[PDB]
Design a protein around this ligand. Structure first.
Ligand SMILES: [N+]
Ligand SMILES: [N+]
Ligand SMILES: [N+]
Ligand SMILES: [N+]
Lengths: 24, 24, 27, 27
C-alpha cells in the first residue's frame, strides 16, 4: 500500500543521490 | 562517498517501511 | 538546487509518515 | 513509535543534504 509507494520513492531518491555523487 | 552512504541509508529505510506495512 | 529539492521531498515524506503513524495510532 | 523515529531520521537526512548542497555551492 501507501508505505510500499513511499519505500519506492526513497529507492528512487537513493538512485538520484548516487547519480549526483558521480557528476554534480 | 557521503551521498552514496546516504543513498544506502534510504534503501535501508525503504526496507523497514515495507516490513512495517506487512505487519505493524 | 537538486539536493535542496530532494531535502524538501524527504521532509515532506517525514510529515506523511507521521500522518500515517498517527492514523494507525488513532484507529 | 518506529514510523515516528523514521520520520526524524528523514528530516535529519534532509538537513545533512542541505549542508552538503551548501558546502558544494560555497566551494
Ligand atoms: N526526486
Ligand atoms: N531506520
Ligand atoms: N512524497
Ligand atoms: N543520517
Amino acid at each position: 500500500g501507501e508505505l510500499k509507494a513511499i519505500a519506492q520513492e526513497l529507492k528512487a531518491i537513493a538512485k538520484e543521490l548516487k547519480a549526483i555523487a558521480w557528476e554534480k
